[PDB]
Design a protein around this ligand. Structure first.
Ligand SMILES: Nc1ncnc2c1ncn2[C@@H]1O[C@H](COP(=O)(O)OP(=O)(O)OP(=O)(O)O)[C@@H](O)[C@H]1O
Ligand SMILES: Cc1cn([C@H]2C[C@H](O)[C@@H](COP(=O)(O)OP(=O)(O)OP(=O)(O)O)O2)c(=O)[nH]c1=O
Ligand SMILES: Cc1cn([C@H]2C[C@H](O)[C@@H](COP(=O)(O)OP(=O)(O)OP(=O)(O)O)O2)c(=O)[nH]c1=O
Ligand SMILES: [Mg+2]
Ligand SMILES: [Mg+2]
Ligand SMILES: [Mn+2]
Ligand SMILES: [Mn+2]
Ligand SMILES: [Mn+2]
Ligand SMILES: [Mn+2]
Lengths: 287, 683, 683, 287
């Protein structure tokens, strides 16, 4: 009921890194404090590392196990965007803002970081556990994918959106907004594929899959809180970032056809600024 | 979760396969004892409470100054002597969340039900202590419920107007359109709903000062009005609500209807403006015969004949318009337009349907004007005259707008107390007082029409509740017999009270002499026909109550001819939604939508069984969506024959019903004399 | 493809490496001989043509009846005696497609250029045949060009208002907002641009009748105004144009600016409403020191002080507002706000920037009021008094709303004829006649201010064309020297004509006694400083013309003190958009945007070289985008020292200029005395 | 030395079939004989099948086994083109020219056609035989992919090109030329990757790999001859098409770094004719 519509929306959102000139960001970058520059670098590396997993494994593995030519084509298109567009875009932002040696060090740090690794390996673990012709294992991986696309990226997206909403780092913020817009539709689409599997299950199996999804969400959420404090306490933003994580967790759940887990909260306004006919038969007139 | 809410939620928990209806009494008792008594401000005596309320700018001191404190104390004792108890949690919750006066911080409760009733009665009595006691007995017995505006605002310093329904005629000119926008904003600022007649505006593509194709049509004015209502949204506490009415023969009818299509472009789409259509018998006749129809350009007709299209008799002037070369018209398919109306109502519930010839074949004030449109609730049907607003420094020709203050009889309580006459007369007195004390200083036509016509709307509620609690099916002929008798009695006593008021004040309403009351043509069916119950079961329901006969109607006709009538219009059955919970009654005369109402208040879900619902009357509490809409139309037509204004008639449709079924229901309602159809609700 | 279009398109076909500029004379000749002479309605004599035009509701007979037919014939012969020839195709095309009178079917040409000029001269003279002949010579020589409204509509029965610029003050009340919407629609209906001051409206989240967080702010009123201007689209040929101005210290300033963001939500976007910001010196001082600034809630200030925030001196009241607890304010970053303004102007060219202190430090009528906002073109700077529109049946307190009728001197033709004094005085007389013949029937404050102030706007055009056709760079010091001398002479002679008119009529403008003209403070710089050209090349351009000296200015000051001044405002430099083609002149005092203007009309494209453009003067016709905006600011500030009103000042920015470059340009304009900045145009 | 330039070339060649309006072919299509229309539909259906498998299976699987994020990005992009652009374009052509029943019938015909099933079996079999970290199985699949890109498509491409060259079906022909332009660069790129693996081998191993490549080519060739006769005999063109496929077989071999195998022949000349924001500093307020 939905693949051709998503095909259309995906291909009409096509874009390339070269379209946005990045050099003018140096005019606001130079005015940020060390903690702001440090947080931005670390967040950016976090997004880059997670998105690479999605391009190399997440999207291609789902495309491999999903049946249907049209679905495979849409999934291929999404994998292409990860590897050919998003990955080049993140690299471009980095090369503009930091010298080569600084980029290498930030990636070394984020590669060793406990909270980034915990979530990256949890997601990758579920992709590696998919078994041929087993729709349960595929569903679990789709849940992981939706959580990455619609939830885990957002502790990271917060900061570029925060600057973008203030008039700072506008070129890289525009790029991030385009990336985020792609991840949103990726999350919705994979969510619909997961619901298709979920709806084929018994009531007991459904309850079991719901417990899986909520348990996974809880593990990721508790690690996100730690990840958030680790990066954002030094710039005083953690409270507001936490509200943004929960709001996006609820969107991820709704993508999977589940009820929201967290109470509704308002979001930081700066980040918001960044973001049956039938005919009468000539007798109906007589009584 | 609150303890009372947990008790209420036990309603749905089936025990012995039966709903625990007794849990609602426990729920209401817990609600009171744990929240209302705690959060109710304490006053040593009534004198101290009154002083605190007056000084702290809570009450208007003028109306309370007409009574010695002894009389106020007597009235309050009369209200409190009843020891009134809310029978369900939802009634008390609704009262203490919507109408109970609260401190400026909305933290404590300053008014109980008795306090509000006493204040309203003292406001009504206008210095009469015995009359105030009578009003207190009427309201505390819940035989009469003043409309939400009157009930909430009476006797309060920081209050909106007690009248909340206004109808505005708009003349075809920029001055008139701007004045209409200003008046709509002023009236919505007061909290009242505003209905505007756009049939006199010229259609899209008409000439403005001998320059052709200059007019934007009714859709541009609709966008203006929608933005005006959105701006004047009552300080955000209640979004501004307005209604636009267009005659079906207006050329902009298709563009007017398309503003409610979901697929409509945001530029043309109107979001917060309700739309109603006025359908003359000519359109229904054309659709019935499948003949090609024409929609006319109003300004060409005005230039050719000197009158507006909606000011003329379409049934007579349609052929002349079609044959006049100087009148511009557009060919349409009447049946296609009917089907478009049905589909639009199925998708969105719009437009409202006003059957113009049904309204005017019984209209008592056609000499003043024909009824051209209805209000935002589709139950107000009065003669209006368009105003001519001229350029600055020129004199405006102020016409007659429409406004009526509403009150509802509680049918179950009135019948239990056998007090149709007394309740009707007291409600008429209170509505007359509300109309007299109302003065809108920014709507000249509204103020002039209120002063001249003295129009009131006396409605009724709890028809389905009263019938179900008496073992009568809403769709049964016995229910229609009871409705016929009850509303005949209500009309008789409202007419008698209007004549008595006219005699006491020695004054009728403007242009009464030309009305059907003055000539006696109004009473023809009452003097020639009998409306006593035809079923022994229904006739027993009226035991202890005098049912007016043909002789009584002849005497009333003679009395009216001798003394006249004070009110141009008296009766209109408004939807009466919010205060139905407080009254513990079914809304208006419509059948119940659901036996138990599931509501969400905060994060707590509340369960509201239909008032009086139980195991033994479960079958009689049939839901509206399961009823035959033809039988509902029969009921409303039986009631409508005794209402001078309209009845707010909602259609309850199942999702399986096609547009053909909706069209058939509309055509049967038009055949059965229905005046307006309010909403097409689908399940 | 018509022959004239083919000849005109040969302009860009380079022959011998140079443009064939001579093809435009051939293009215009062919255009005339093959289209205009053919499609011109033929009349045997002037009498028959005039009788036909008057009979067919083309020409008003009121102004023509003041002259004996011999006088009209003499005036028409005077117009035709010049044998005026359009030098380029675009001028004649513009005239005969926009201003030439055409039959009601728009198929034939009833008016030639000479006929239109003679009709305008007869309208101006008001019965004076010699005055009419002087006007005919002035306009046929193209020394003075009446504004598009006056030029097009003068003497026409169907004509709209001859005034097209309107400024309205909006008071902080629903009555005033409704009246403002009505007046805006009424004035747009007349085809005039309407500018509104929204600084008095309370900010979003302010209380209405002790009800907090009820007000919707200036953005809801802006949505209402946008819808009103969209509805009054003036037949749709020219969409309704309105501008809203807000003080930078208003609380809603950020929301006010967000309406113009492309990313803005559609429910907040205002498509048809231009926005200007009024920036006091206090804001620039706060941004310069990087200090944290506050935006105030206007109603709190009004309640605390009994006067509006925009009626007070922010440079004196900002600290008091900040230190006053009863005044509500929220913190902002002035530099962040300036950067946001620059970004918004780059993206959309909005908002217009008005430097309030630059305007009011030289304002002659501060006693009447300070200049609080500007018009839709950003050059009207006059004192305004807000009106108090009360309830119906309550008398209104009519204030002063700004309006001025426009005219432009042709600098090249005025200098070639050495007729600065005579041209200025005749233009002042014509503008005064237009002002005296204007009567707005639905804008009480506009009409009252027109009667009391008698404000006129005399602009100039062809500054860049004149300079380029004389071997002078626009940015060069000699260009500024010529502009200084020429506009000083224009101001001198306009003041002399205003004083002479006051002496002849015996009346001055209302509240003239408190103006700087009456006290002599206006003439301080003119009596102390000599404004004769400092370059021999510039001084030679004025040879044959008497340049007023300090003694002449002393004499004029004494004369004004004796007799007063008839006009509160005399000089304003409007954009002069489409009428510049008819005059074959560059637009206003701005530098040209392109050397050759390529435009597509119908399905054929046309090329318009800048007037007088040739190989010899090609380099002097430097485009604005290639110009140093600092030198343009210097030139405009040099001119502005002799203009009592503002100057429409468009910023021409290259795509490579950052927001910092725009901010620096605005800061330099504020530093140099620039009153307003109109548009940010990017190449 | 080459991936970056292939990346740039691939992304700059990006297109969608919707860019080309097809209603202009309606009349030249109507005018063809029933035999011609039948061959045309079947030819494009055979192409659709090849692109379906190249997009679903071939390109993603090669992407999985090739090392390097940039090489993977190119291969992922090529995969997307196969199924999201190329395979879909044929349906755009079918939906314009043919009624639904004829479309349904031709897709049923691909399922039961023995030559088309054989070629799919052979090519996809080799893709699915790739073993992780086994460069020889990867080489074999890359040879198969080059043979699909640069040889097998051409029995199909002949006919749209043959019409384009006569000024017939030129909108459909424009789509086909864009597809062909893509496949030419895809065949070169995969050819270069195959040569990388081949060049790592001993002389003895190389000799075996040439045997594999030539044996596979001959087996595919013999099947393609029968397929060509089956499709083209009814339009009289089988011998001409055979010359064309031999020509392109030589190009495939060359893409693999091998000598041409078939002798040069004259191809139908008709077919040859068918071919910014910066902050304000303190000094900005002084002049
Ligand atoms: N450039 C122009 N601008 C305005 N009117 C023009 C122009 N060219 C021609 N006309 C009008 O067309 C008429 C015919 O033009 P044309 O050049 O053929 O005239 P002519 O017989 O040579 O003499 P004259 O120039 O005195 O009219 C002119 O008399 C004038 O009315
Ligand atoms: C001025 C104006 C009017 N209208 C419509 C609304 C009015 O119902 C209608 C008449 O406008 P009027 O205000 O009556 O204009 P008029 O009286 O000067 O012209 P006429 O003599 O023809 O009556 O035109 C527009 O649609 N757009 C406009 O801008
Ligand atoms: C009535 C109304 C006013 N307003 C705004 C517009 C006006 O500028 C402002 C004042 O409204 P007013 O019309 O002046 O209301 P008021 O004078 O009765 O109350 P107060 O004396 O406290 O001002 O409120 C709204 O935003 N929405 C509304 O519905
Ligand atoms: Mg009119
Ligand atoms: Mg007020
Ligand atoms: Mn990505
Ligand atoms: Mn993604
Ligand atoms: Mn392909
Ligand atoms: Mn390929």
């Amino acid at each position: 009921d939905f693949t051709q519509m998503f095909y259309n929306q995906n291909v009409k959102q096509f874009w390339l890194p070269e379209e946005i000139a990045l050099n003018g960001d140096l005019l606001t970058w130079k005015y940020l404090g060390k903690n702001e520059q440090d947080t931005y670098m670390k967040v950016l590396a976090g997004l880059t590392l997670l998105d690479t997993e999605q391009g190399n494994t997440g999207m291609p593995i789902v495309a491999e196990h999903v049946d249907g030519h049209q679905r495979k084509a849409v999934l291929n298109f999404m994998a292409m965007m990860e590897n050919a567009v998003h990955a080049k875009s993140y690299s471009n932002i980095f090369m503009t803002l930091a010298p080569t040696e600084t980029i290498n060090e930030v990636f070394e740090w984020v590669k060793q970081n406990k909270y980034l690794q915990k979530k990256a390996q949890m997601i990758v673990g579920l992709y590696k556990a998919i078994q041929k012709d087993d729709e349960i294992s595929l569903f679990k991986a789709m849940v992981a994918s939706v959580y990455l696309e619609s939830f885990l990226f957002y502790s990271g997206f917060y900061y570029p959106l925060y600057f973008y909403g203030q008039g700072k780092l506008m070129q890289s913020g525009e790029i991030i907004n385009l990336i985020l817009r792609d991840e949103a539709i990726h999350g919705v689409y994979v969510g619909l594929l997961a619901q298709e599997i979920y709806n084929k299950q018994t009531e007991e199996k459904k309850a079991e899959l719901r417990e899986f999804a909520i348990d996974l969400l809880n593990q990721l959420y508790e690690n996100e809180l730690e990840y958030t404090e680790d990066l954002y306490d030094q710039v005083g933003l953690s409270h507001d970032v936490k509200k943004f994580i929960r709001y996006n967790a609820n969107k991820a759940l709704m993508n999977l056809g589940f009820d929201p887990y967290f109470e509704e909260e308002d979001i930081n306004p700066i980040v918001l600024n960044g973001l049956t006919v039938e005919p009468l038969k000539d007798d109906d007139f007589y009584f | 979760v609150p303890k009372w809410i947990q008790l209420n939620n036990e309603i749905m928990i089936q025990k012995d396969g039966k709903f625990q209806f007794d849990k609602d009494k426990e729920a209401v008792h817990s609600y009171f004892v744990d929240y209302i008594n705690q959060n109710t401000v304490f006053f040593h005596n009534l004198k101290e409470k009154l002083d605190y309320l007056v000084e702290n700018q809570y009450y208007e001191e003028e109306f309370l100054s007409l009574y010695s404190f002894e009389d106020i104390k007597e009235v309050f004792k009369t209200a409190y002597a009843k020891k009134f108890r809310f029978p369900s949690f939802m009634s008390a919750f609704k009262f203490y969340n919507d109408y109970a006066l609260k401190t400026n911080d909305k933290k404590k409760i300053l008014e109980r039900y008795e306090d509000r009733i006493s204040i309203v009665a003292l406001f009504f009595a206008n210095g009469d202590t015995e009359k105030a006691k009578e009003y207190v007995n009427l309201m505390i017995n819940q035989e009469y419920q003043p409309s939400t505006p009157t009930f909430l605002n009476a006797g309060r310093k920081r209050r909106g107007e007690l009248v909340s329904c206004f109808l505005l005629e708009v003349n075809d000119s920029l001055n008139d359109i701007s004045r209409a926008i200003d008046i709509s904003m002023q009236l919505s600022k007061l909290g009242g709903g505003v209905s505007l007649n756009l049939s006199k505006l010229r259609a899209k593509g008409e000439a403005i000062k001998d320059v052709e194709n200059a007019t934007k049509g009714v859709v541009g004015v609709m966008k203006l009005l929608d933005n005006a209502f959105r701006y004047a949204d009552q300080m955000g506490q209640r979004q501004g609500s307005g209604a636009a009415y267009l005659n079906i023969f207006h050329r902009d009818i298709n563009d007017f209807l398309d503003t409610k299509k979901i697929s409509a472009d945001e530029d043309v789409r109107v979001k917060t403006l309700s739309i109603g259509v006025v359908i003359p018998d000519k359109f229904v006749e054309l659709a019935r015969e499948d003949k090609a129809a024409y929609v006319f350009y109003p300004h060409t007709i005005y230039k050719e004949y000197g009158q507006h299209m909606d000011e003329m008799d379409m049934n007579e002037m349609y052929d002349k318009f079609v044959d006049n070369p100087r009148v511009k018209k557009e060919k349409i398919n009447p049946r296609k337009l009917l089907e478009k109306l049905a589909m639009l109502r199925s998708e969105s519930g719009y437009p409202y349907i006003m059957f113009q010839d049904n309204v005017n074949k019984v209209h008592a004030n056609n000499h003043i004007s024909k009824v051209k449109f209805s209000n935002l609730c589709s139950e107000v049907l009065q003669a209006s005259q368009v105003s001519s607003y001229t350029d600055y420094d020129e004199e405006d020709e102020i016409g007659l707008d429409i406004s009526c203050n509403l009150g509802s009889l509680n049918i179950l309580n009135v019948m239990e107390h056998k007090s149709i006459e007394k309740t009707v007369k007291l409600a008429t007195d209170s509505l007359t007082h509300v109309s007299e004390t109302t003065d809108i200083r920014n709507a000249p036509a509204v103020r002039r029409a209120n002063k001249a016509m003295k129009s009131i709307g006396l409605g009724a509620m709890n028809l389905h509740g009263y019938l179900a609690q008496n073992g009568i099916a809403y769709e049964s002929p016995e229910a229609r017999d009871f409705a016929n008798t009850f509303f005949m009695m209500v009309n008789f006593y409202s007419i008698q009270r209007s004549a008595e008021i006219a005699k006491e004040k020695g004054e009728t309403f403007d242009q009464y002499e030309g009305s059907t009351y003055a000539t006696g043509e109004y009473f023809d069916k009452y003097v020639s026909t009998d409306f006593s119950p035809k079923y022994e079961k229904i006739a027993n329901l009226f035991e202890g109550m005098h049912i007016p006969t043909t002789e009584d109607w002849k005497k009333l006709k003679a009395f009216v001819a001798e003394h006249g009538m004070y009110h141009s219009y008296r009766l209109c059955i408004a939807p009466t939604g919010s205060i139905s919970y407080v009254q513990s009654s079914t809304a208006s005369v419509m059948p119940i939508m659901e036996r138990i109402e599931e509501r969400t208040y905060g994060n707590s879900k509340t369960y509201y069984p239909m008032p009086g619902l139980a195991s033994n009357n479960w079958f009689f509490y049939k839901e509206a969506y399961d009823m035959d809409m033809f039988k509902v139309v029969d009921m409303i037509a039986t009631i409508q024959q005794h209402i001078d204004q309209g009845i707010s008639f909602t259609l309850f449709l199942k999702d399986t019903m096609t547009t053909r079924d909706l069209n058939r229901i509309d055509l049967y309602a038009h055949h059965r004399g229905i005046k307006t159809i309010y909403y097409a609700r689908t399940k």
